[PDB]
Each structure stands twice: as structure tokens, then as C-alpha cells.
């Protein structure tokens, strides 16, 4: 336990799970929404999937 | 053609084509019958199979 003639600096990164807030003003972003589309995958004997 | 000192027993199986009679009583089973339905399977360079 003798000190050599050179000192050190240590560096280590740590990770946090954090819970945030988000403010957004009124009427800030504008959206344009379309009508959706259907399409049927071919017939499976017991069920049909759209 | 001298007898070796041991005999042998030979086993064969044989197949017979035959006609048959099947008797089934009255109302022995219940058949439930669903509607027939169609779906495409391939499309080759020339034709389409269903």
C-alpha cells in the first residue's frame, strides 16, 4: 500500500430509468387523416383475415 | 444332396383378390354436410388452377 508517484482519475457512466413530462401547446400541429383501406387475404378454411 | 444336420421350416405369405359384401343397417350414422367452397391455388405462366 505505497503510493506510486502518479495519481489517477476514474470515470464511469451510469444509467437511469427516468419518467418524463411532455407539454404541447394548443392547436400546435395539424393532422390530415385519410379513409382506410381493406384487403382480404385468401380464404382460410375456418377463418378469413382482412 | 446329403442331409445337413438340421431341418428348416419355411414361411410364406399369399395374397388373394376377392369380392365382398357390406351390410349396413338403417340410419346408422349422422352425416353433417357443409357448403362447398372454392379458392385459387396457383398461377403459372399459362393457366390458373382452382
Amino acid at each position: 500500500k505505497i503510493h506510486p508517484g502518479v495519481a489517477m482519475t476514474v470515470v464511469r457512466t451510469d444509467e437511469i430509468l427516468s419518467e418524463n413530462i411532455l407539454f404541447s401547446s394548443r392547436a400546435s400541429t395539424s393532422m390530415f387523416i385519410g379513409t382506410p383501406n381493406v384487403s382480404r387475404r385468401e380464404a382460410r378454411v375456418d377463418a378469413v383475415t382482412f
Side-chain angles (χ1 to χ4, degrees), chain A:
Chain A
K1 309 241 68 176
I2 290 305
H3 171 236
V6 284
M8 294 167 297
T9 83
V10 184
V11 160
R12 58 118 195 283
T13 52
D14 291 309
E15 270 202 340
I16 329 277
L17 177 63
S18 64
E19 299 186 288
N20 300 249
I21 307 188
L22 173 100
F23 180 84
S24 68
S25 55
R26 186 186 45 89
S28 67
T29 299
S30 64
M31 305 275 303
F32 309 103
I33 328 282
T35 309
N37 298 348
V38 210
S39 173
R40 87 184 270 270
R41 180 262 181 212
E42 183 178 2
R44 174 182 334 166
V45 301
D46 306 288
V48 192
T49 81
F50 301 80

